[PDB]
């Protein structure tokens, strides 16, 4: 009765509400791509380090 009146009135008279995707964007985090896929740095090239190291530590066995 009154159930029908409200049901009818509500359903009919509102069935669109605001909904803008752009407004949503403000409220959410932005996708941005990773940075620095940097390849590892190469170090201690040559036996220069090794010859230095054999000499450098006097105690090679004591």
């Amino acid at each position: 009765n009154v159930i029908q009146d409200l049901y009818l009135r509500e359903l009919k008279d509102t069935k669109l509400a605001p909904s803008t995707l752009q407004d949503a964007e403000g409220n959410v985090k932005p996708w941005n791509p990773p940075q620095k896929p940097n390849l590892p740095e190469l170090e201690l090239q040559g036996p220069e380090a090794l010859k230095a190291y054999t000499e450098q530590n006097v105690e090679t066995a004591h």
């Binding site: 159930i3 409200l6 049901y7 509500e10 359903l11 509102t14 069935k15 509400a17």
Partner: peptide, 14 residues
């Protein structure tokens, strides 16, 4: 959100 609400109101009876 409308459809579920519409269901609840429809679920008022008797």
């Amino acid at each position: 959100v409308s459809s579920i609400l519409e269901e609840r109101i429809k679920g008022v009876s008797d």
